[PDB]
């Protein structure tokens, strides 16, 4: 029952839909899209122990987007990863789904609203530590320009938060907030200042640093924008109010873009799994699981100056224009070099035009939050990262390569 989909548009459904589905099924449904294509997935019917997993890439390799069980259709997904997969599992117990997908083409400023106001961020992507006991201030009401109250926690303290799962690794460049006027009392509420916490997986968190305290609203009605000092790469966002007028109430928008919106900046398959485990290698290990080196996907990281290396075989010659480096799940690399090959035998370092020597790249400052490091494009099938300086705990790293088809 496993099938790959490549046509511009098509349908995906449980075997025998709409008849009741057979027992003891494990089906894999993979959509593959060419570079600079977005995959749009919409669910029409959903009725199911038993589950449907959606994967940002290859199942059990790429990150899990979500797991679904009941009678609620999964919210619409737009992926620019080049691959989006479903796994459908049933057992003997009493017993599906129908979906459709589309493949569409995708001054560019990285300042696009990510979808709080529009609803492109679905209700199921929004959550919070708590909500006000009358039920009129749910997390789902935290949408900019929303006409029905906003999010309010059950208690007003600086421990409460509103959480948004963007589902995919995204560039975050700005945050807008409003307070809200109660439709029941006409009392005004707003956040005066807040902190930002981010994460690639929803477990490992980093408080954004200058802790950066963002100045927020001074009334219940006007949008206040705070632009970040530099773009963050992340999936999960938490807004943590620190001070407020009368009480915590929040409506929100997030701004940014996708990694792939930059020229020749496609993730070449470490995170997703299109770069298979056999294409991944290293100077030394803790003997190994090649998947442990994958950006974000890995639940640990590669553990082995200027002697150790991690190596990625892209499969065919491509234009390489950068890497995404991540720490390990606590250690991380602070400084590194990069080399590349077209045959896997001979190597050349990425030069620094300024100093006319092999370039010494800045690594991470946290174990989870990744960093993009770009460089002048070169032709390469193989890439190596050489850690130079690192956290006191030692070398720990996850990686992705950025580029496009050669031209």
């Amino acid at each position: 029952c496993s099938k790959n989909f490549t046509s511009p548009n098509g349908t995906i459904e449980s075997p025998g839909f709409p008849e009741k589905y057979p027992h003891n099924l494990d089906c894999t449904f993979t959509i593959l899209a060419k570079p600079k294509m977005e995959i749009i997935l919409q669910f029409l019917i959903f009725d199911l122990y038993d589950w449907l997993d959606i994967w940002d890439g290859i199942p059990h390799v790429g990150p899990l987007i979500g797991k679904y069980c009941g009678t609620k259709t999964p919210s619409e997904l737009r992926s620019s990863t080049g691959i989006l997969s479903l796994t459908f599992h049933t057992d003997m117990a009493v017993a599906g789904f129908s979906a459709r997908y589309y493949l569409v083409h995708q001054n560019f400023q990285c300042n696009v609203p990510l979808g709080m106001e529009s609803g492109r961020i679905a209700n199921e992507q929004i959550s919070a530590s708590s909500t006000y006991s009358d039920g009129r201030w749910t997390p789902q009401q935290s949408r900019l320009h929303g006409d029905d109250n906003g999010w309010t926690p059950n208690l007003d303290s600086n421990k409460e938060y509103l959480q948004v799962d963007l589902r995919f690794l995204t560039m975050l460049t700005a945050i807008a907030t409003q307070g809200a006027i109660s439709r029941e009392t006409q009392n005004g509420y707003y956040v005066k200042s807040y902190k930002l916490e981010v994460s690639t997986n929803g477990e490992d968190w980093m408080v954004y640093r200058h802790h950066k305290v963002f100045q927020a609203n001074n009334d219940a009605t006007e949008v206040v924008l705070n632009k970040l000092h530099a773009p963050l790469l992340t999936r999960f966002v938490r807004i943590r109010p620190q001070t407020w007028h009368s009480g915590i109430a929040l409506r929100l928008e997030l701004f940014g873009c996708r990694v792939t919106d930059a020229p020749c900046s496609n993730m070449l398959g470490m995170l997703s799994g299109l770069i298979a485990d056999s294409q991944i290698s290293a100077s030394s290990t803790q003997e190994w699981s090649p998947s442990a080196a994958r950006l974000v996907s890995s639940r640990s990281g590669w553990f082995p100056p200027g002697e150790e290396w991690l190596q990625v075989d892209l499969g065919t010659p491509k234009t390489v224009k950068g890497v995404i480096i991540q720490g390990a799940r606590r250690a991380f690399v602070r400084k590194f070099k990069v080399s590349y090959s077209l045959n896997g035998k001979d190597w050349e370092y990425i030069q620094d035009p300024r100093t006319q020597q092999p370039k010494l790249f800045e690594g991470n400052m946290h174990y989870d939050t990744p960093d993009i490091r770009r460089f002048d494009p070169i032709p390469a099938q193989y890439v190596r990262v050489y850690p130079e300086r690192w956290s006191p705990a030692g070398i720990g790293m996850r990686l992705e390569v950025l580029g496009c088809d050669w031209t």
Partner: antibody
Amino acid sequence: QVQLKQSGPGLVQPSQSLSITCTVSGFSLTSYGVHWVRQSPGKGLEWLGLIWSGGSTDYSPAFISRLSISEDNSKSQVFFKMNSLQADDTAIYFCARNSYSSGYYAMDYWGQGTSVTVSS
Amino acid sequence: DIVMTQSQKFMSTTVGDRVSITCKASQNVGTAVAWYQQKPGQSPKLLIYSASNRYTGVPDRFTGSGSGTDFTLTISNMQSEDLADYFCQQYSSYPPYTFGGGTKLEIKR
């Protein structure tokens, strides 16, 4: 209380367009999608199209060439616009709530209907 | 397109009696079926969703049944206020929301 309040014209000249606004209250358009349906003696009840939470649309194949559904979340308004009406588009037009934000679900709350006559 | 056939245009009944309204889909639609009640000069009202689930607030005397192609709406004890046109519809596959032609009830008194 959940309400869908329709506003639109009673008379449309042949080959002109029909605009109807569906103003919703008691729920958010980011929580529930909205359908458009019409009812006539000759053709019964016909689905025209929908908009989901997030703004993605689906149209009946008979109407896709001349129908637009869009919305304004901040105003709780869904905009229906159909072009080039003719005599056989005479009907009562309805908006109706989708029982969920996405998916094909049952229409659980209905607007009051807008009677539209296509005539010179 | 899927066709939803209600062969009963009109049905005679009596206060207190059982009414069984049938609807036949031209292809299999699973349980993706709803029933609506429409009284004169009013908008339709949802009674039943997913073939057999009673919508919240709908009186107990309304029950839906069936799966695949054959669907039934049962009113277990007809009341005068149940005079209406009753419509089935499918939303299993595209184009969705094809409606039956309606079944109007008449009460003998």
